[PDB]
Structure 1
Amino acid sequence: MAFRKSNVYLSLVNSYIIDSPQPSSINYWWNMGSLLGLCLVIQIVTGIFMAMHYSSNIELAFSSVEHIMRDVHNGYILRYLHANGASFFFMVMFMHMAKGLYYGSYRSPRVTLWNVGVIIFILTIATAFLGYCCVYGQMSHWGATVITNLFSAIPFVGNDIVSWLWGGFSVSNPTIQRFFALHYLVPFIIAAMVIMHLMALHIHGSSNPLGITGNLDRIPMHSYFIFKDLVTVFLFMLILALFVFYSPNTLGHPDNYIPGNPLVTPASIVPEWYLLPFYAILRSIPDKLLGVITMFAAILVLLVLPFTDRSVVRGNTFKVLSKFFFFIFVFNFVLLGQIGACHVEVPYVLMGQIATFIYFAYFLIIVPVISTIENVLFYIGRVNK
């Protein structure tokens, strides 16, 4: 045989990106997974080169980042590609998960592939939280104060988890030094989960936008989907370059250019845009212990979808009622992000409580009821009785 199939290390390359059989009818939504692999390489490589110039002491952390912007050769390119690249990583990941909801990719036999992806999403959220602390701006200090104080409401162990997380009595110098060391490590755990994610995908292959079997017409990966992947790689890099060079502070907050002061509270404490819907869910529960449980339940409720979908058809292509309620769920997610950036005022308090209910009722009430009705309408529209 050829050397790409007989060698021990090249046969893994050949069976994944060269000779792997793809369904002939997948569209451009199936290109988001390879863009996420490019984003992870960009975040790791710009991370190492900035870490050669960074100091994690609380007296030196803010001035180290200003030293990178002013004194390091091409240092402003390294930071702006890193900060804007984190926002592009979350946008591609949101579209990748929404493709899986629409086409039914979570269903059997791909449940293990969907469960490993939910773990990856949790680790990415924790990574971006720890890197934002390392700036030690004014939004960095008070955002870490709000989130770490949530864990003291846990019964019997709460007041000792928080001081074990602080290394002291508040957010201080041991907190920033341990948060930078954890920030180095978790992207390497993410890279190992991506390898386990690709092993489960190799077993069954990909789905297709019609929802039915792809075993009857396959084309190989090399020179068809390699060149289709190049179209979205160059479009991604062009839009990212327009943000890095021409508008580099649009997706950030101007309060993060003030150094962290534990005696002055800002007028508004706002997270980054990709964490705003989970911030509005937390502020809609008045009790403090039930608010942090509901905040973590908003991620873990993705695991109930293989059991609450009752349809005998995979995907949303031929279902008009499931199409309508999918886009109700999408614009509800955008509204929750907008409520999370407002003040706690009338009428945004009641609007956030209704939108929180609609988020959880989609997974647990709407999907099993609508998919049961669509099973029966397909039957009685054909059977003569």
Structure 2
Amino acid sequence: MAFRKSNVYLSLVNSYIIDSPQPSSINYWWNMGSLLGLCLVIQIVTGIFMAMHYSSNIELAFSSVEHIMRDVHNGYILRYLHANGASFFFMVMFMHMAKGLYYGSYRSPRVTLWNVGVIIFILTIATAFLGYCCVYGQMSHWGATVITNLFSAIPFVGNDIVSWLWGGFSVSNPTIQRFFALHYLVPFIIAAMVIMHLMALHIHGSSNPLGITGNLDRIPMHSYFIFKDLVTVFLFMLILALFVFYSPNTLGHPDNYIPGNPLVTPASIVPEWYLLPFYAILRSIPDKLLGVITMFAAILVLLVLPFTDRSVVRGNTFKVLSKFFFFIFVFNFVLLGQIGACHVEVPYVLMGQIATFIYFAYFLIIVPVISTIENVLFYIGRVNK
């Protein structure tokens, strides 16, 4: 046989990116996976070449970031690529998970793939939070303080857990040093989970935007989806180059260029832009413990998703009401982000509570009821009696 098939190392390269049978009807929404892989490689390479100049002391963190942006040759390129690419990493990941919810890729036989995806999502949120605290600006310090006090809400144990996390009594030098070590560490766990994700994908192949089988008309990976992914790679690099070179500090928060001061609290403490729906979910609950439980349940309710989709056809392509309520859900998630960006003021508390309820109601009540009604409507539309 061929050398790409008989060699031990090149057989994986073959069976994953050369001769992988892909369904020939998949559109550009089946390209966000390759795009996330490229953006992860961007994050790791800029992280290494920018962490060769970073000193993680609490008295030397912000000065070393400014040393990167001023004294290091092309260091502004590195930091701006790194922060804005983390923003694009979460945006492409949100689009990828929306592709997962829409076309029904969570359903059987792809439950393992969906669960490893949710694990990757949790690890990526953790990585972004740790790296945002490594800047040690104003928002970095106070966001670390608020999230660890949320961990202090745990009954009978929590204060000692938080003194363990801090490595002291408040967010201090051991906290920033261990956040830098963990933040260097967790992306390699993300890379291992990505390899496990690709294995759980490869044992059944991709889905298709129709929700029927794709075993009939398969076309290879090579040259076809290689050049289709090359198209979206160049578009992604174009938009990233715009938001790096022409308007770099748009997505960030301007308070993060104030150095970390434990005495001055800011006027409005807000995380970076993508953690705002989860921050709104947590802020909508009038309790600390139930708030933390609801914030983690807002990700575990993605795990309870394949067991509630009672639709007998895969994906929302050929269904009306499920497609409508899907876009209700997407614009609700955007409204959660925008509620979280605001203050704790009338009527944003009541709207945050209603928006959290519509989030959990979509994942727990709306999907099974609308899928059951859509099944019975498909049946009685064509069966006569």
TM-score range normalised by the length of the shorter chain: over 0.9
Distance in 2, Cα, partners of 1:134 & 1:316: 41
* TM superposition shift of 1:20: 1.0
Name the CA distance, whole Å, in 2 between partners of 1:269 and 1:93: 25
Deviation at 1:378, TM superposition (A): 1.3
Deviation at 1:215, TM superposition (A): 0.9
What's the CA shift string for 1:113-170, capped at 9, x where partnerless? 0000000000000000111111111111111111100122211111110000011111
Match of 1:347 in 2: 347
Q: Deviations over 1:177-214 (max 9, x none)?
A: 11101010000000000110111111100111110011
Q: Distance in 1 between matches of 2:65 and 2:357?
A: 41
Structure 2 residue runs without a partner (length 5+): none
CA drift at 1:50: 1.0
SS of residue in 2 equivalent to 1:366 = helix
d(CA) in 2 for partners of 1:301, 1:170: 32
Structure 1 residues 282-318: Cα deviation after superposition (integer angstroms, max 9, x where no partner): 1111111111110110001001111101111101111
CA distance in 1, matches of 2:255, 2:160: 31
Counterpart for residue 189 of structure 1: 189
**Matched residue of 1:180: which SS?**
helix
Q: CA deviation at 1:329?
A: 0.3
Q: Aligned equivalents of 1:168 and 1:325: distance in 2?
A: 47
Distance 1:281 1:93 in 2: 20
Alignment partners' CA distance in 2, 1:88 and 1:105: 23
Distance in 1, Cα, partners of 2:87 & 2:364: 30
Cα distance in 1, alignment partners of residues 339 and 93 from structure 2? 22
Question: What do residues 328-378 of structure 1 show as CA deviations (whole Å, max 9, x unaligned)?
Answer: 001100111011011111111111110010000011101111111111111
Report the CA distance between 1:381 and its aligned residue.
1.6
By how many angstroms is 1:51 displaced?
1.1
Work out the CA distance in 2 between the residues paired with 1:305 and 1:368. Answer: 10
Percent identity for Structure 1 against Structure 2: 100
CA distance in 1, matches of 2:10, 2:248: 41
Looking at structure 2, the residues matched to 182 and 7 of structure 1 have their Cα atoms a distance apart, in angstroms, of 37
SS at match of 2:45: helix
Measured on the aligned residues, the alpha-carbon RMSD in Å equals 0.7
- TM-score normalised by the chain length of structure 2: 0.99
Unaligned stretches of 5+ residues in structure 1: none
Where 1:275 maps in the other structure, the secondary structure is helix
* Secondary structure at the counterpart of residue 307 of structure 1: coil
1:17-59 deviation line (CA, Å, top 9, x unaligned): 1111111111110010000000111000011111111111111
In 2: Cα distance, 1:223 partner to 1:168 partner: 55
Separation (CA, whole Å) in 1 of partners of 2:47 and 2:153:
35
**Deviations 1:219-252 (Å, cap 9, x if unpaired)?**
1111111111111010000111111111010111
Structure 1 length-normalised TM: 0.99
Aligned length: 385
User: In 2, Cα distance between the equivalents of 1:269 and 1:227?
Assistant: 44
1:232-278 CA-to-partner distances (Å, cap 9, x unmatched) read 01000011111111101011111111111111111110111100000
